[PDB]
Amino acid sequence: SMACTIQKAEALDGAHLMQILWYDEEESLYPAVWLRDNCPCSDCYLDSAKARKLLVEALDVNIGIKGLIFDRKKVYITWPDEHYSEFQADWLKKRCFSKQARAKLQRELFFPECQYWGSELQLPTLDFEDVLRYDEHAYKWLSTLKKVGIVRLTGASDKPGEVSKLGKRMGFLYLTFYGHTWQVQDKIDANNVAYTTGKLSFHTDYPALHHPPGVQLLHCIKQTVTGGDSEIVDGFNVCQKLKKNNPQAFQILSSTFVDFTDIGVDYCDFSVQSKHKIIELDDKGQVVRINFNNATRDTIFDVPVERVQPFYAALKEFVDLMNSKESKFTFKMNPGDVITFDNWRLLHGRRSYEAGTEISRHLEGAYADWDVVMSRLRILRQRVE
Amino acid sequence: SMACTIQKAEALDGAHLMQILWYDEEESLYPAVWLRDNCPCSDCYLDSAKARKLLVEALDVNIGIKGLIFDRKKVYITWPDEHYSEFQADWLKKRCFSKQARAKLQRELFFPECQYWGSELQLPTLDFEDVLRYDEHAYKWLSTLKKVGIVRLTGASDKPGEVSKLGKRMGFLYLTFYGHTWQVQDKIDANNVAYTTGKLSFHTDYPALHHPPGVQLLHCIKQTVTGGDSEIVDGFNVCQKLKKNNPQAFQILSSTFVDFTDIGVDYCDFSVQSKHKIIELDDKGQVVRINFNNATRDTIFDVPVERVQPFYAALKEFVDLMNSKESKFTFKMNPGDVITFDNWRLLHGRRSYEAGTEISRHLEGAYADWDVVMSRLRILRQRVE
Ligand SMILES: C[N+](C)(C)NCCC(=O)O
Ligand SMILES: C[N+](C)(C)NCCC(=O)O
Ligand SMILES: O=C(O)CNC(=O)C(=O)O
Ligand SMILES: O=C(O)CNC(=O)C(=O)O
Ligand code: NI
Ligand code: NI
Ligand SMILES: [Zn+2]
Ligand SMILES: [Zn+2]
């Protein structure tokens, strides 16, 4: 295209910048040091790995272009030490340092589109076997998981092993002290409040870890009629409402380190401790993760005494908002259903049910790392486009 | 002890605080809301899980103590709604909200002691089989790993499978796209600069992931006489020197997001992207992780053009300090040697060596999560004390 065709290339700014004038009349600028650092020749770049061999030690940070020629599709550069580089037009164009170009590329890499939701949620639903068999369906699955935060898959079996198939479709699951996969059932000497018939209030899984699981997979093998309905809420949507309604409570929860703990025996013996802010913000003040399980929050609370009661007051306000009828979405899982969701963004819970002489309710769960998921999503997108 | 024996317990501050006067005359304060939240009774606390059943929804954040009695070893509290709680003296004492008590407990949980080192490093060394067989030795191993950042284990075999034994001793290894364990050897169509005979400059492993591996294990199966010596540097020590010598360069590297990438096929097919600050600080300005591999730093750099050359100038200053003869420690791995090190703190590298018609050099590596390691360290400490 005219946008990707070179009209003129020139060294500017004491030879420290290259400027490309494109055939659409737009101009791009490329620092000489960045071009040299990204030389694609075999000395500098290992093509089989698509990786940089060039060392920092080799890079003159004050380098300027010694000579430059070009045609419509490439630039050819000589360097002061006689090194020689070639750069393709389309490669340069994609990597333009303009804010618009950089932002476009970041969108393509990280899929930031987010659709916030309340009690009006239309639970995205796909077929399990279709997702396993067809790239178009697996793509819709992971893209929707990223954007909405949850997808339900229907028509799995009523036998263990289904979350493992989804894990292989992603790449691999995320092993924790509760196993490769884990069985949510009422257990004698339960090592986790999950493994009882009690109500689970809204929580994220595993804030006792530094790096809580990014994605959760939960498959219904057996369901009870006595209770055990599912509830979910969009934590990012809730945090937005909290900041607006109660900025003091938002400030406390986004700045206060809370200790989490887990001790017991499952896959192996464990004694786990972490610290997190319940509302975890990026450097720009945007919420990126919620870290909260009331069951594993430690008895240890490392704050001065005067900060304690205001913390709990803040926390109450947050949970009250999560529970509001405008925020929460309630549903019942049947055998064969699987939900896959963003464990950093949603909070989830379940209603109490009745104990029995044999197991009346059984879910099999597993976790996946967001990096594993995003990798597969990038591959799938390329395959489908 | 007199320190742990109750002399007086009293509700204060409108019944919103409990004060304990101990037999040493020291005073501790406990917020009423915190005591109620941490009731150990069977309604509030699941003993088999050592976890809180009590919901946020159940907690009156404005609660005060209705009645209190005590003896030397426990306090007995009635609440306004008629709930009833018992707290043991030793439990309360450990959880005193004084800064001194809180800081002591944080030390016991997280083992913060750090011993910075330069080229004078005396490489801590233990026997491999001793570490597998004896808790006293496994304790010294992990405690030293945490404090110094590296331990060498000698007397392993010259066969694959040794890092896997150490992984089981910790709990489990950290699976990545390069496998459960991985073979560092020269490979045709290498998917990583590591799998060549080239020099690796100082790097941390895997900044292409959001959560880079906490701990690295590297076992020498075959070594070459033609090169391939090992080099290490204490990144936390280096960052301290950089902040002192060049505060501008420190500021740039601790505030600038750098994109990292990895594309290829190994355990499965992958297309990985991340963003990190190379020098990653906590909320108090202390360095907690270094994220840097020059080979996987992307060609994509998401900064305005005017910030590019100063970034590279900063980076050069950092690498130059890492390479200084006062900072780096160089050694040669022989068959049977294993190093286990903090991949968030150290940077590591290796000298070039000569290609041959069969494999002349072979290391087997693996990763572990710091949470897995710290769990085992806590268990071991308890077993040994
Ligand atoms: C379901 N399992 C694996 C027990 N995790 C619950 C969540 C947690 O303990 O934070
Ligand atoms: C040794 N392996 C597993 C290839 N990793 C190298 C480090 C990296 O690619 O950042
Ligand atoms: O049992 C359910 O429906 C939900 N389970 C969980 O959220 C859990 O085990 O952490
Ligand atoms: O080969 C060596 O001695 C060191 N290897 C690495 O650091 C690597 O593979 O990332
Ligand atoms: Ni859960
Ligand atoms: Ni390495
Ligand atoms: Zn080159
Ligand atoms: Zn109670």
Q: Is the dihedral of CA B109, B39, B92, B63 positive or negative?
A: positive
Q: What is the DSSP letter of A179?
A: B
The approach used to solve this structure was X-ray
d(CA B215, CA B149): 9
Q: Label residue A51 exposed, middle or buried (CB < 10 Å: 0-12, 13-18, 19+).
A: buried
At residue A218, the 3 state secondary structure works out as strand
**DSSP string across A257-272:** EEEEEEEEESSSEEEE
A256 DSSP assignment: -
d(CA A265, CA A46): 46
**Alpha-carbon gap, residue B144 to B149, rounded angstroms:** 7
Which contacts (CB < 8 Å, 24+ apart) does range A374-377 have?
A: A374/A110, A374/A111, A374/A146, A374/B272, A374/B273, A375/A171, A375/B177, A375/B270, A375/B271, A375/B272, A376/A138, A376/A142, A376/A169, A376/A170, A376/A171, A377/A111, A377/A139, A377/A142, A377/A143, A377/A146
Strands A150-154 and A125-127: parallel
Paired tokens of A78 = 């000589």
Rounded Cα gap, residues A135 and A126, in angstroms: 13
The candidate with the shortest Cα–Cα distance to B224, out of B364, B360, B362, B363, is B360
Residue of B nearest to A188 (CA): B48
For an interface test with B, the pick among A13, A43, A48 (most B C-beta atoms closer than 10 Å) comes out as: A48
| A-B C-beta contacts closer than 8 Å | 216
The whole-angstrom distance between residue B154's C-alpha and the CA centroid of its chain comes to: 23
DSSP single-letter state for residue A41: S
Cβ-based neighbours of B381, under 8 Å, separated by 6 or more: B139, B143
Q: Which helix (H) or strand (E) holds A77?
A: strand A74-78
Q: Taking the C-alpha atoms of A22, A27, A28 and A31 in order, what is their torsion angle to the nearest 10 degrees?
A: 120
Number of residues assigned to chain B? 385
- The response to whether residue A292 sits with its C-beta less than 6 Å from ligand 1 reads no
Amino acid in the structure at residue A155 = G
- Measured in whole angstroms, how far is the alpha carbon of residue B238 from the centre of its chain? 18
Retrieve residue B47's tokens.
């003993």
Backbone angles phi, psi at A253, to 5 degrees: -70, -25
What are the phi and psi torsion angles at B192 (to 5°)? -160, 140
Eight-class DSSP state of A98: S
Q: 3-state class of A125 per DSSP? A: strand
Nearest-CA distance from B75 to chain A in Å? 17
Q: Which of B371, B374, B382 to mutate to test the interface with A (most CBs of A within 10 A)?
A: B371
**Which residues of chain B neighbour A274 with C-beta distances below 8 Å?**
371
**Helix B370-384 × helix B135-148 angle, to 10°:** 130
Beginning with the edge strand found earlier in the chain, give each strand of the sheet holding B329-331 in spatial order.
B200-203, B346-350, B230-234, B329-331
Query: Do the beta carbons of residue A147 and residue A139 sit within 8 Å?
Result: no
Q: Which of A52, A10, A14 is nearest to A27 (CA)?
A: A10
Q: Which of B275, B279, B299, B298 is nearest to B290 (CA)?
A: B279
Report the alpha-carbon angle A295-A296-A298, nearest 5: 115
Within a 13 Å sphere around the CA of B381, how many CA atoms are in the beta-carbon half?
A: 15
Residue ranges and CATH numbers for the domains of chain A are: 1-98 (3.30.2020.30), 99-385 (3.60.130.10)
Q: How far apart are alpha carbons A125 and A148 in whole angstroms?
A: 12
Instruction: Kindly state the tokens that stand for B29.
Output: 């304060």
- How far B266 CA lies from chain A's nearest CA (Å)? 11
Rounded to 5 degrees, what angle do the CA atoms A325, A329, A345 make? 110
CA of residue B348 to ligand 6 center, whole Å:
6
- Residue A88: which H helix or E strand, with range? strand A84-88
Residue B240 has a CB neighbour count (10 Å cut-off) of 15
Across the beta sheet with B74-78, what order do the strands follow?
B67-70, B74-78, B84-88
Ligand 4 pocket, CB under 6 A: B 184, 194, 200, 205, 230, 348, 350, 363
Contacts of B290 in chain A (CB under 8 A): none
Of B57, B97, B296, the CB nearest to A304: B97
Tokens read off for B174:
């950290």
A83 labeled binding residue = yes
Residues A346/A195, Cβ–Cβ less than 8 Å: no
Alpha-carbon distance of B101 to B107, in angstroms, equals: 10
> Which amino acid is present at B384?
V
In whole angstroms, give the CA distance from residue A189 to residue B6.
Answer: 33
| Ligand number nearest to the C-alpha of B206 | 2
* CA–centroid distance for A284 within its chain: 17
Instruction: Give CA separation, A257 vs A118, A280, A380, in Å.
Output: 28, 10, 38
Distance CA A191, CA A198 (A): 14
Which residues touch B4 (CB under 8 Å, ≥6 apart)? B22, B89, B90, B93
Which of A105, A301, A319 is nearest residue B300 as measured by Cβ atoms?
A105
Helix, strand, coil proportions of chain A in percent (round to 5)?
30, 30, 40
d(CA A137, CA A130): 6
Instruction: Tell me the sheet residues that pair with B8.
Output: B21
CA atoms of B85 and B249, how far apart (whole Å):
56
Instruction: Centre a 10 Å sphere on the Cβ of residue B94 and count the other Cβ atoms it contains.
Output: 15
Burial (CB count within 10 angstroms: exposed 0-12, middle 13-18, buried 19+), residue B225: exposed
Residue B348 CA to residue B331 CA, distance in Å, equals 11
Contact (CB<8Å) A52/B198: no
With CA atoms as reference, report the closest residue to A264 among A182, A171, A367. Answer: A182
Which residues of B are less than 8 Å from A271 in CB distance? 375, 378-379, 382
CA distances from B185 to A133, A243, B221, B228, B354 (A): 36, 53, 10, 11, 12
Residue A78, C-beta contacts closer than 8 angstroms, at least 6 positions apart: A65, A66, A67, A68, A84
Distance of CA A94 to the CA centre of its chain: 24
* Nearest-angstrom CA–CA distance, A248 and A329: 27
Q: Are strands B125-127 and B150-154 parallel, antiparallel or unpaired?
A: parallel
Q: Is A214 in contact with A149 (CB distance < 8 Å)?
A: no
Atom nearest to B182 CA in ligand 4: 9
How many angstroms separate the Cα of B341 from the Cα of each of A37, A303, B49, B281? 30, 32, 33, 20
Are β-strands A230-234 and A346-350 bridged in parallel, bridged antiparallel, or unpaired? Answer: antiparallel
Q: Is residue A138 a contact partner of residue B141, using CB atoms and an 8 Å limit?
A: no
Sign of the torsion formed by the C-alpha atoms of A135, A137, A138 and A144: positive
> Chain A interface, mutation test: which of B188, B271, B293, B322, most A Cβ atoms within 10 Å?
B271
Report d(CA A2, CA A9) in Å as an integer. 15
Is residue A320 packed enough to be buried (19+ CB in 10 Å), middle (13-18) or exposed (0-12)?
A: middle
**Alpha-carbon distances of B244 from A109, B251, B282, B315, rounded to whole Å:** 36, 11, 18, 15
Which tokens is A315 given? 């926390």
Nearest to A129 by CA among A167, A165, A173, A160: A165
Residue count (chain A) = 385
For residue B239, CA distances in Å to A381, B233, B245, B281, B346 come to 40, 11, 10, 10, 11
Helix (H) or strand (E) holding A32: helix A32-37
SS (H, E, C) chain B: CHHHCEEEEEEECCCCEEEEEECCCCEEEEEHHHHHHCCCCCCCEECCCCEECCCHHHCCCCCCCCEEEECCCEEEEECCCCCEEEEEHHHHHHCCCCHHHHHHHHHHHHCCCCCCCCCCCCCCEEEHHHHHHCHHHHHHHHHHHHHHCEEEEECCCCCCCHHHHHHHHHCCCCCECCECCEEECCCCCCCCHHHCCCCEEEECCCCCCCCCCCEEEEEEEECCCCCCCEEEEEHHHHHHHHHHHCHHHHHHHHHCEEEEEEEEECCCEEEEEEEEECEEECCCCCEEEECCCCCCECCCCCCCHHHHHHHHHHHHHHHHHHHCCCCCEEECCCCCCEEEEECCCEEEEECCCCCCCCCCCEEEEEEECHHHHHHHHHHHHHHHC
SS3 state of residue A19: strand
Resolution in A: 1.8
The amino acid occupying position A175 is L
Residue A324, both tokens? 């509001």
Token digits of residue A3: 């946008």
Cα atoms in the 13 Å half-sphere on the side-chain side of B12: 13
Which residues on chain B are in Cβ contact (under 8 Å) with A319? 56-57
Atom 3 (ligand 3): residue with closest C-alpha? A350
